[PDB]
Amino acid sequence: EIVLTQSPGTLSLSPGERATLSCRTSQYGSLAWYQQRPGQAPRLVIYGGSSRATGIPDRFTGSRSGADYTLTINRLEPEDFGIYYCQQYEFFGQGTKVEVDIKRTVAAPSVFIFPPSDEQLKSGTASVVCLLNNFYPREAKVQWKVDNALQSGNSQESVTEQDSKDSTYSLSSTLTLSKADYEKHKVYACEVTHQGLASPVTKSFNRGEC
Amino acid sequence: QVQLLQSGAQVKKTGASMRISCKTSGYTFLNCPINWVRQAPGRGLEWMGWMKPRGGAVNYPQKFQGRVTMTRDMSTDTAFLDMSNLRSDDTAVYFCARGKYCTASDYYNWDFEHWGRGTLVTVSSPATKGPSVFPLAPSSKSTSGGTAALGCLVKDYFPEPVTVSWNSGALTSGVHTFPAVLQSSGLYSLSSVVTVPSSSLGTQTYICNVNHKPSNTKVDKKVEPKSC
Amino acid sequence: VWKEATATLFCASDAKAYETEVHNVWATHACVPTDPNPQEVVLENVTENFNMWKNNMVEQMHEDIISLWDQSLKPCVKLTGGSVITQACPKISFEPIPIHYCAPAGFAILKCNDKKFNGTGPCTNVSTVQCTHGIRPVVSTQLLLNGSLAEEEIVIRSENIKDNAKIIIVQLNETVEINCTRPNNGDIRQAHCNISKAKWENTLKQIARKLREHFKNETIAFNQSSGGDPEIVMHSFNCGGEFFYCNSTQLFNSTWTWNNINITLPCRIKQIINMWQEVGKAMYAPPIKGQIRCSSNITGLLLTRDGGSSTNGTTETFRPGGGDMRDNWRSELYKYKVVKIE
Ligand SMILES: *[C@@H]1O[C@H](CO)[C@@H](O)[C@H](O)[C@H]1NC(C)=O
Ligand SMILES: *[C@@H]1O[C@H](CO)[C@@H](O)[C@H](O)[C@H]1NC(C)=O
Ligand SMILES: *[C@@H]1O[C@H](CO)[C@@H](O)[C@H](O)[C@H]1NC(C)=O
Ligand SMILES: *[C@@H]1O[C@H](CO)[C@@H](O)[C@H](O)[C@H]1NC(C)=O
Ligand SMILES: *[C@@H]1O[C@H](CO)[C@@H](O)[C@H](O)[C@H]1NC(C)=O
Ligand SMILES: *[C@@H]1O[C@H](CO)[C@@H](O)[C@H](O)[C@H]1NC(C)=O
Ligand SMILES: *[C@@H]1O[C@H](CO)[C@@H](O)[C@H](O)[C@H]1NC(C)=O
């Protein structure tokens, strides 16, 4: 009965900057804004389009211009990271992701490649692991190559949160193959792209030789 | 202080039924509706309906009608959510929510100031399985500048979670334990890695301690350089 | 002029001192006689604001009906707060009588005379009254019985029609008779309700038209209760001191797009009931022998609109609502407000 259109999909900013979140609705109804941090329940930020909820500081503001509603977050803090949803009655917008973290100097990932263990091969499966360690900012690209063939959709990646000591991220990428398919190829490689690297970095091994 | 206490996480088989609870305190339970809002992994917020503790009156959207039942226990100030014929899609965090404005004579349902912590419900055909722990061996070519990387692959387990520690907690510096990924097989997998001085590889022992409580699987795996 | 106040009103009725009937007994001690010559003063060039949803008269009436039920009803077993009490449960004489609420000295009751009044905001035709009209404290769900009719056309009343969590109070402009009977001598708890099918359906067609004013060019559907206590899923009411629970599915099963037989509702006389006056459970003795029969006028209904989206769109679903007895008092007290003459 009410479609709420949120824009943009993602906002990538630094602390102290201003975040402008948009919500479009052509329908009547008191509009609310929610902040949802990872692994947490949503928190009411704005209600009635422009009023601040309990404990919400003055740097968060809500405004309306006809069908266009805006949530502005001034002087961004790392704790403002999360997904923001708008709402009218029982209907929610699809959300806008706000990416903000603790700033540090650009750090290129240290890349490591791990062949499948002899133990895993005996069980009939082969997992090849590529580690992108201690990098900053978050944005990193991994490309798998098996005898120069670009692997598309058969790998899964996982990323850690900012490191307990140095505020960096680490990423692991796992390429899954059967033992039969693994034994049919020689060169296993992972190409890494990051702003800390002037040119992409490739780490590789040839199956059987070490 | 208004409080919404939700029941523990649940792991369900496809086609099963579930019952989640929300125990309220800090206000007169009778006064306003309880709402249920779900969130599928990596997806938005979806209202499942409201229930009024006064008479147990309900309101469900068409999509949830015939499959969702919202009830309450007035003696314990508890709201319940029942769901039948669970599908894989029903995997979500289920939240109970209450409006900001609530008096003995008036309320506004929709401004959700009060939320429970959420109840994770995982719906799947796979059964409880302990993980296989494989080493991520430190190599000669896979080493630089005095530091070497090593780790362990904690593969093919169900359900979540698994915890990983190194050398019974004695090793913390340089440890990275990655969030688990759900494989196309329906089983979970994760890796934990550590960077150590390459000079210590022949004098220091590296053991990853893996614990999968739902299957009672505890493994201490020694990770060492591959003998060539 | 005058200021909106919360004064302690007094009550008046035509209660009979010889009657053993429960409402008559309560009113003989709590009320004064009805004014033989009541004076109504129509006010010229006066616009006053009324709000049926924030009316303190509703709260006072609610308190009076709770006390009436508490001192009158005789349950075998009562469960409140985890504790149970057993007592003698003889049958009683139960039939609501009209009760008038009156303003004391220094106070007046303002009456809204706007025939199309929606329940909130301004009203141009206002009059000062000493007492309200006679209100029957009818405890029923889904259907409002033996109340007052809308003077012109059907009136739909909601604090906010666009908010599905807000109750919709419908006031009919023509009565629809509901004949209820527990036949003389089989199943002592089996009962039924008869309603003219053609009268009810034409009423539903006109309710759909009034609802469509807030939901332009949309299909209006009436569906059965989505759930809750038996008191709210079914049309519940009193008849000869017995608690009747009627399956209302047949009354709410129609779709209305932009375009003499009876409906027989299956009923049951229940002994285990969820109390409306307070949180608890009450148990009554089995029903009395002979024919238990009463005829009532449906003068309104309580509806809840379905929330969320629909697969097809262009259709709004309405289901019988309830839960709060304050809405039954509100359906009659909507046109009044208490004001201080000072
Ligand atoms: C309302 O009517 C529709 C068909 O018009 C039906 O599918 C639905 O079950 C009814 N309401 C419920 C959920 O009982
Ligand atoms: C009732 O009518 C008045 C006067 O036209 C208007 O101000 C008010 O908003 C209406 N109430 C509702 C609930 O729409
Ligand atoms: C009011 O009653 C008349 C009959 O006296 C009827 O024609 C009219 O349609 C009623 N109003 C509504 C909206 O049902
Ligand atoms: C509901 O109405 C339909 C007409 O669309 C009718 O076929 C059916 O018998 C009704 N169900 C009941 C209440 O028996
Ligand atoms: C409808 O019910 C009334 C009693 O409430 C009865 O007099 C009448 O004959 C019934 N109509 C039919 C067709 O049976
Ligand atoms: C039942 O309906 C008929 C009309 O069909 C009406 O005359 C009669 O008075 C109603 N029953 C009672 C007990 O009043
Ligand atoms: C409606 O009024 C009639 C006549 O006073 C009475 O017999 C009937 O029981 C009343 N209905 C209810 C539910 O009080």
Side-chain angles (χ1 to χ4, degrees), chain C residues 31-92:
Chain C
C31 316
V32 296
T34 301
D35 197 340
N37 54 294
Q39 243 273 73
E40 184 173 328
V41 177
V42 180
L43 305 143
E44 55 173 80
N45 288 257
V46 171
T47 299
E48 277 290 284
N49 291 340
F50 292 81
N51 188 339
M52 67 180 282
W53 315 98
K54 285 171 179 69
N55 190 356
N56 199 267
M57 298 176 89
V58 169
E59 225 59 61
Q60 192 179 161
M61 196 183 168
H62 196 57
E63 176 214 84
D64 289 331
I65 306 143
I66 288 164
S67 64
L68 195 153
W69 276 60
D70 289 345
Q71 73 187 247
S72 301
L73 278 88
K74 297 169 176 180
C76 321
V77 5
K78 202 162 94 82
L79 190 237
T80 50
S83 104
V84 47
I85 294 104
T86 63
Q87 41 140 113
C89 47
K91 295 279 165 184
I92 61 156

XYZ file of all heavy atoms in Angstrom, chain C residues 31-92:
487
model
N -28.516 6.202 40.792
C -29.152 7.238 39.972
C -30.317 7.991 40.599
O -30.891 7.557 41.595
C -29.536 6.683 38.601
S -28.265 5.658 37.819
N -30.686 9.113 39.960
C -31.811 9.977 40.318
C -32.884 9.810 39.214
O -32.547 9.257 38.168
C -31.373 11.467 40.504
C -30.407 11.628 41.676
C -30.796 12.073 39.218
N -34.150 10.271 39.364
C -35.113 10.116 38.257
C -34.743 10.951 37.030
O -34.010 11.938 37.150
C -36.439 10.593 38.867
C -36.229 10.548 40.353
C -34.791 10.917 40.527
N -35.239 10.544 35.847
C -35.016 11.256 34.584
C -35.785 12.578 34.639
O -36.894 12.618 35.183
C -35.414 10.363 33.389
O -34.637 9.168 33.438
C -35.188 11.036 32.032
N -35.169 13.666 34.119
C -35.758 15.008 34.087
C -37.082 14.960 33.308
O -37.066 14.583 32.132
C -34.775 16.012 33.440
C -35.041 17.498 33.677
O -36.191 17.856 34.034
O -34.106 18.306 33.482
N -38.240 15.271 33.948
C -39.517 15.228 33.211
C -39.545 16.214 32.043
O -39.972 15.841 30.948
C -40.570 15.543 34.280
C -39.831 16.243 35.360
C -38.438 15.699 35.350
N -39.028 17.443 32.257
C -38.941 18.475 31.223
C -37.472 18.886 30.954
O -37.007 19.908 31.468
C -39.871 19.672 31.519
C -39.692 20.308 32.878
O -39.965 19.705 33.923
N -39.251 21.558 32.888
N -36.702 18.078 30.179
C -35.304 18.457 29.913
C -35.205 19.587 28.895
O -35.885 19.554 27.865
C -34.656 17.157 29.429
C -35.772 16.332 28.911
C -37.069 16.826 29.482
N -34.388 20.607 29.210
C -34.201 21.771 28.349
C -32.913 21.703 27.545
O -31.839 21.459 28.099
C -34.280 23.078 29.158
C -35.442 23.983 28.746
C -35.089 24.908 27.605
O -34.963 24.495 26.446
N -34.955 26.191 27.903
N -33.039 21.900 26.224
C -31.930 21.916 25.273
C -31.873 23.313 24.654
O -32.874 23.783 24.103
C -32.116 20.829 24.193
C -30.953 20.719 23.218
C -30.982 19.561 22.236
O -31.520 18.485 22.585
O -30.414 19.716 21.131
N -30.719 23.985 24.779
C -30.532 25.330 24.240
C -29.588 25.259 23.041
O -28.404 24.969 23.210
C -30.070 26.350 25.320
C -29.802 27.729 24.714
C -31.087 26.454 26.455
N -30.124 25.506 21.835
C -29.360 25.500 20.584
C -28.550 26.804 20.519
O -29.117 27.889 20.655
C -30.270 25.285 19.340
C -29.456 25.284 18.045
C -31.077 23.992 19.464
N -27.222 26.688 20.350
C -26.318 27.840 20.328
C -26.101 28.400 18.928
O -25.795 27.645 18.000
C -24.978 27.501 21.001
C -25.060 26.974 22.434
C -24.017 25.914 22.675
C -24.964 28.097 23.447
N -26.261 29.733 18.789
C -26.099 30.472 17.532
C -24.670 30.995 17.344
O -24.066 31.482 18.304
C -27.141 31.611 17.403
C -27.181 32.602 18.560
C -28.093 33.794 18.343
O -29.323 33.643 18.529
O -27.578 34.885 18.005
N -24.137 30.886 16.100
C -22.789 31.316 15.691
C -21.651 30.701 16.550
O -20.631 31.360 16.789
C -22.692 32.854 15.633
C -23.428 33.485 14.478
O -22.827 33.895 13.478
N -24.743 33.615 14.604
N -21.831 29.440 17.006
C -20.866 28.746 17.862
C -20.260 27.503 17.203
O -20.988 26.580 16.839
C -21.454 28.435 19.275
C -20.533 27.526 20.093
C -21.754 29.718 20.045
N -18.922 27.473 17.089
C -18.170 26.328 16.581
C -17.296 25.803 17.723
O -16.477 26.549 18.268
C -17.402 26.669 15.288
O -18.337 27.048 14.279
C -16.578 25.500 14.774
N -17.506 24.539 18.109
C -16.764 23.893 19.193
C -16.095 22.612 18.729
O -16.647 21.886 17.895
C -17.681 23.602 20.395
C -17.872 24.787 21.332
C -16.646 25.171 22.139
O -16.328 24.455 23.115
O -16.005 26.191 21.796
N -14.911 22.327 19.288
C -14.159 21.119 18.971
C -14.543 19.963 19.877
O -14.662 20.130 21.094
C -12.653 21.374 19.051
C -12.113 22.287 17.975
O -12.719 22.506 16.921
N -10.929 22.811 18.204
N -14.713 18.783 19.280
C -15.043 17.555 20.001
C -14.042 16.480 19.618
O -13.541 16.490 18.498
C -16.462 17.087 19.640
C -17.597 17.965 20.122
C -17.961 19.110 19.420
C -18.357 17.599 21.225
C -19.025 19.909 19.855
C -19.431 18.392 21.650
C -19.750 19.546 20.968
N -13.739 15.561 20.539
C -12.841 14.447 20.257
C -13.328 13.242 21.013
O -13.077 13.116 22.210
C -11.373 14.773 20.564
C -10.393 13.711 20.108
O -10.734 12.540 19.892
N -9.135 14.091 19.973
N -14.024 12.351 20.299
C -14.597 11.121 20.845
C -13.554 10.155 21.415
O -13.871 9.401 22.329
C -15.500 10.423 19.806
C -14.759 9.864 18.598
S -15.823 9.043 17.380
C -16.100 7.460 18.186
N -12.322 10.187 20.877
C -11.207 9.311 21.260
C -10.519 9.750 22.548
O -9.867 8.929 23.190
C -10.208 9.154 20.096
C -10.898 8.901 18.788
C -11.193 9.822 17.829
C -11.526 7.679 18.376
N -11.923 9.238 16.819
C -12.138 7.922 17.129
C -11.584 6.384 18.916
C -12.827 6.930 16.428
C -12.265 5.399 18.219
C -12.877 5.675 16.989
N -10.711 11.026 22.943
C -10.164 11.638 24.161
C -11.306 12.283 24.961
O -11.286 13.486 25.243
C -9.075 12.669 23.805
C -7.755 12.049 23.385
C -6.797 13.101 22.833
C -5.456 12.523 22.435
N -5.553 11.638 21.242
N -12.327 11.480 25.290
C -13.507 11.937 26.020
C -13.533 11.285 27.410
O -13.656 10.066 27.516
C -14.773 11.613 25.206
C -16.062 12.223 25.712
O -16.126 12.885 26.755
N -17.128 12.012 24.962
N -13.377 12.098 28.468
C -13.352 11.642 29.863
C -14.672 11.006 30.338
O -14.663 10.248 31.306
C -12.908 12.776 30.786
C -12.419 12.309 32.132
O -13.180 12.227 33.103
N -11.137 11.990 32.219
N -15.786 11.271 29.624
C -17.114 10.706 29.907
C -17.111 9.192 29.683
O -17.834 8.475 30.372
C -18.188 11.347 29.014
C -18.346 12.836 29.220
S -19.533 13.557 28.058
C -21.015 13.361 28.954
N -16.313 8.720 28.701
C -16.137 7.307 28.352
C -15.561 6.561 29.576
O -16.072 5.502 29.947
C -15.230 7.164 27.094
C -14.802 5.717 26.853
C -15.909 7.740 25.855
N -14.508 7.138 30.197
C -13.812 6.608 31.368
C -14.746 6.490 32.576
O -14.710 5.476 33.272
C -12.597 7.497 31.702
C -11.324 6.725 32.008
C -10.818 5.811 30.906
O -10.510 6.316 29.802
O -10.753 4.583 31.144
N -15.602 7.476 32.789
C -16.547 7.443 33.891
C -17.612 6.392 33.711
O -17.951 5.718 34.636
C -17.217 8.796 34.185
C -17.963 8.733 35.530
C -18.671 9.995 36.017
O -19.547 9.908 36.876
N -18.270 11.152 35.523
N -18.118 6.269 32.505
C -19.106 5.244 32.181
C -18.498 3.855 32.339
O -19.121 2.990 32.952
C -19.670 5.446 30.767
C -20.940 4.674 30.550
S -21.638 4.763 28.900
C -22.842 3.456 29.016
N -17.263 3.663 31.835
C -16.524 2.404 31.937
C -16.431 1.948 33.396
O -16.756 0.805 33.682
C -15.123 2.544 31.313
C -14.448 1.236 31.021
N -15.041 0.286 30.209
C -13.259 0.757 31.458
C -14.202 -0.739 30.185
N -13.111 -0.496 30.911
N -16.042 2.856 34.314
C -15.935 2.605 35.757
C -17.288 2.142 36.341
O -17.315 1.204 37.148
C -15.439 3.892 36.460
C -15.355 3.825 37.976
C -15.665 5.146 38.653
O -16.865 5.439 38.860
O -14.712 5.902 38.949
N -18.400 2.790 35.925
C -19.749 2.465 36.394
C -20.209 1.087 35.955
O -20.776 0.364 36.767
C -20.771 3.530 35.953
C -20.643 4.861 36.661
O -20.183 4.878 37.821
O -21.030 5.882 36.069
N -19.959 0.719 34.683
C -20.345 -0.593 34.147
C -19.520 -1.725 34.759
O -20.087 -2.785 35.031
C -20.435 -0.601 32.600
C -21.369 0.529 32.143
C -20.929 -1.957 32.046
C -20.949 1.152 30.966
N -18.210 -1.484 35.041
C -17.337 -2.472 35.702
C -17.930 -2.799 37.080
O -18.159 -3.974 37.376
C -15.853 -1.996 35.793
C -15.167 -2.037 34.409
C -15.047 -2.813 36.832
C -13.855 -1.250 34.329
N -18.225 -1.756 37.890
C -18.808 -1.917 39.222
C -20.176 -2.603 39.160
O -20.457 -3.441 40.010
C -18.915 -0.572 39.930
O -19.802 0.289 39.237
N -21.010 -2.263 38.146
C -22.331 -2.873 37.942
C -22.152 -4.385 37.761
O -22.776 -5.150 38.484
C -23.042 -2.248 36.719
C -24.557 -2.496 36.557
C -25.206 -1.370 35.776
C -24.849 -3.813 35.842
N -21.267 -4.804 36.837
C -20.968 -6.214 36.566
C -20.355 -6.939 37.767
O -20.796 -8.045 38.095
C -20.086 -6.344 35.308
C -20.873 -6.335 34.031
C -21.694 -5.343 33.576
C -20.908 -7.372 33.040
N -22.255 -5.708 32.373
C -21.796 -6.952 32.024
C -20.288 -8.629 32.920
C -22.067 -7.736 30.899
C -20.558 -9.402 31.803
C -21.423 -8.948 30.800
N -19.369 -6.306 38.439
C -18.690 -6.872 39.612
C -19.613 -7.168 40.790
O -19.476 -8.225 41.409
C -17.508 -6.002 40.049
C -16.351 -6.073 39.078
O -16.342 -6.995 38.234
O -15.433 -5.229 39.189
N -20.547 -6.254 41.100
C -21.487 -6.459 42.205
C -22.745 -7.258 41.819
O -23.469 -7.708 42.706
C -21.838 -5.127 42.906
C -22.760 -4.190 42.124
C -22.916 -2.844 42.795
O -23.998 -2.487 43.276
N -21.846 -2.057 42.831
N -22.986 -7.456 40.507
C -24.177 -8.145 40.004
C -23.984 -9.588 39.569
O -24.841 -10.425 39.860
C -24.799 -7.357 38.862
O -25.162 -6.043 39.257
N -22.913 -9.874 38.818
C -22.680 -11.223 38.312
C -22.196 -12.203 39.366
O -21.406 -11.845 40.243
C -21.845 -11.229 37.036
C -22.666 -10.950 35.776
C -22.776 -9.462 35.479
C -22.109 -11.670 34.612
N -22.737 -13.423 39.313
C -22.453 -14.461 40.296
C -21.779 -15.699 39.673
O -22.463 -16.685 39.386
C -23.738 -14.813 41.076
C -24.311 -13.648 41.889
C -25.703 -13.958 42.415
C -26.254 -12.859 43.292
N -27.612 -13.191 43.802
N -20.441 -15.671 39.440
C -19.777 -16.853 38.862
C -19.455 -17.923 39.904
O -19.190 -17.584 41.057
C -18.508 -16.276 38.230
C -18.226 -15.029 38.994
C -19.472 -14.585 39.707
N -19.481 -19.211 39.496
C -19.168 -20.366 40.357
C -17.723 -20.277 40.788
O -17.426 -20.472 41.961
C -19.419 -21.691 39.639
S -20.886 -21.713 38.587
N -16.821 -20.058 39.804
C -15.381 -19.957 40.003
C -14.810 -18.717 39.322
O -15.218 -18.374 38.206
C -14.571 -21.289 39.788
C -15.447 -22.436 39.288
C -13.342 -21.111 38.898
N -13.919 -18.012 40.031
C -13.270 -16.811 39.521
C -11.770 -16.952 39.705
O -11.310 -17.287 40.798
C -13.807 -15.561 40.239
C -13.608 -14.266 39.455
C -14.513 -13.145 39.966
C -13.862 -12.255 40.999
N -13.004 -11.216 40.372
N -11.043 -16.668 38.655
C -9.619 -16.755 38.628
C -9.040 -15.401 38.285
O -9.186 -14.935 37.195
C -9.235 -17.740 37.566
C -7.832 -18.248 37.404
C -7.250 -18.020 36.048
C -6.858 -17.946 38.490
N -8.357 -14.797 39.234
C -7.714 -13.541 39.035
C -6.399 -13.555 39.753
O -6.326 -13.850 40.912
C -8.577 -12.419 39.562
O -8.989 -12.733 40.883
C -9.792 -12.304 38.735
N -5.351 -13.279 39.025
C -4.036 -13.236 39.587
C -3.448 -14.530 40.058
O -2.596 -14.535 40.899
N -3.871 -15.634 39.501
C -3.303 -16.900 39.900
C -4.010 -17.505 41.079
O -3.628 -18.542 41.524
N -5.047 -16.847 41.565
C -5.818 -17.364 42.682
C -7.292 -17.547 42.349
O -7.879 -16.769 41.634
C -5.622 -16.490 43.914
O -6.733 -15.668 44.144
N -7.882 -18.603 42.865
C -9.214 -18.949 42.507
C -10.112 -18.980 43.705
O -9.727 -19.376 44.760
C -9.211 -20.331 41.970
C -8.418 -21.176 42.905
C -10.609 -20.864 41.850
N -11.341 -18.602 43.494
C -12.371 -18.424 44.519
C -13.670 -19.086 44.033
O -14.082 -18.873 42.893
C -12.547 -16.917 44.908
C -11.276 -16.360 45.596
C -13.766 -16.689 45.813
C -10.409 -15.456 44.712
N -14.289 -19.910 44.888
C -15.547 -20.596 44.584
C -16.658 -20.049 45.471
O -16.459 -19.892 46.678
C -15.412 -22.125 44.688
O -15.079 -22.482 46.028
C -14.384 -22.690 43.722
N -17.818 -19.755 44.872
C -18.974 -19.185 45.574
C -20.302 -19.647 44.968
O -20.315 -20.149 43.840
C -18.898 -17.633 45.583
C -18.435 -17.021 44.259
C -19.177 -15.767 43.879
O -18.610 -14.668 43.859
N -20.443 -15.907 43.505
N -21.418 -19.461 45.713
C -22.773 -19.780 45.252
C -23.054 -18.962 43.991
O -22.698 -17.779 43.918
C -23.795 -19.453 46.330
N -23.640 -19.612 42.982
C -23.876 -19.005 41.674
C -25.342 -19.100 41.205
O -25.599 -19.724 40.165
C -22.926 -19.635 40.662
S -22.875 -21.442 40.755
N -26.326 -18.477 41.911
C -27.711 -18.546 41.419
C -27.883 -17.690 40.167
O -27.117 -16.752 39.951
C -28.532 -18.010 42.591
C -27.621 -17.088 43.293
C -26.238 -17.654 43.139
N -28.873 -18.027 39.340
C -29.174 -17.293 38.116
C -29.740 -15.919 38.453
O -30.375 -15.757 39.493
C -30.124 -18.098 37.215
C -29.509 -19.398 36.695
C -28.595 -19.186 35.492
C -27.726 -20.386 35.231
N -26.774 -20.144 34.115
N -29.458 -14.924 37.606
C -29.895 -13.540 37.814
C -30.802 -13.039 36.679
O -30.882 -13.668 35.621
C -28.676 -12.580 38.045
C -27.716 -12.553 36.824
C -27.936 -12.902 39.352
C -26.856 -11.289 36.671
